[PDB]
Design a protein around this nucleic acid. Sequence first.
RNA 1: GGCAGGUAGCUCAGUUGGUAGAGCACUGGACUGAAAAUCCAGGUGUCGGCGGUUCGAUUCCGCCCCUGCCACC
Length: 367
Amino acid sequence: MVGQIAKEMGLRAYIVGGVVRDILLGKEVWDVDFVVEGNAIELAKELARRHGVNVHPFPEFGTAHLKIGKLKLEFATARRETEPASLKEDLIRRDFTINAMAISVNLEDYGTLIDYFGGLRDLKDKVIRVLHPVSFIEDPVRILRALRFAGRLNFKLSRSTEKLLKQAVNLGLLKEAPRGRLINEIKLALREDRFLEILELYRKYRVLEEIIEGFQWNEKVLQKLYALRKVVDWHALEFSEERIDYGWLYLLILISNLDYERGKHFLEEMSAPSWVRETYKFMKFKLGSLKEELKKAKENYEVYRLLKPLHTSVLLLLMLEEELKEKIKLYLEKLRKVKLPKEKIEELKKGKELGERIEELKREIMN
RNA sequence: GGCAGGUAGCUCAGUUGGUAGAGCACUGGACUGAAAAUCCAGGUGUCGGCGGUUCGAUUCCGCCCCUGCCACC
């Protein structure tokens, strides 16, 4: 119906940006971005009125947000910067060729893909390419972004793009960039399932040393990241109903050997989840003594005592130890399974004495 | 899309999971020609909603509701 409204107003609207990419990648998304030649606000308001849904106009940005069902729609007016602007002018300010395409929702040309810069070819050849060599200089954050994209889609940077990226990092433009944008981009990165590869690309071009203070790369951390890779694989395989955010664990591994001050400050800027901060603060000190206690663990009940109060993240951190791996495994799918019948429980009750008694019964069952 | 706040009618605290609170409106009676003040007391509440784990969830976790702000595709 968007093309109908675009016809009545005599305008031109286009599905734009990564959405189009995700459409060509066979990925369905509930968030759609539009570029409209002429006023986008009136189009969004009319569309929202015809569907009888609340509209959220933003005149200063020239954009409007409206939610239809699960679909989150954002209409934007064509602009030549971050005179009327043609679609091509709006597409030329974008970062990568694969993000620079558009599809027309206008009724006559409906279904046609509009590619000016040959982004379709770069999507075909799995190439991450900038439109202009001045790209990274304008928006330094894109440095991460490209890598992140190169992480997710498993594509490869163009030689021009790569040289421009290396030259961009060498000038230290990553430091001059706003902290919030960078941190946000990293937060976007750690949510990917391929985020490990993104970390590999981060290590190759050494972008993490610039953002984080006092951070350096070594082999132990990397092998720890692959061990964590295997652990994450198995845990997300069998226990998948219990799944949590895995990226923050990698982030903890990277900052493990780093100073505690810069670590807490980093978690402060990144706005890490509570359990992440807790896992880190427990890792910096208590983890050593904990592991040493797990080494002294003989009976299953002492293991139960030294494990159960801890979160899942701590356990996954303990799975890095080869000696403790089969023990934690024994703890997960075996060491905790239990229930009790009626009569017996009723006899157990004949405050805290009840719970302690229960613990005594469990330690009686285990060993 | 991520991070705080959600506790009475309003303004607000509360973590090793273990049987909840302040200050003023609410009912009832002692008090009064009536009313209020004040006294005894006591509702001050499924501590957002729905499930899950647990002997037991305001707390652990998951999906969502609301409000405010930071961030922007």
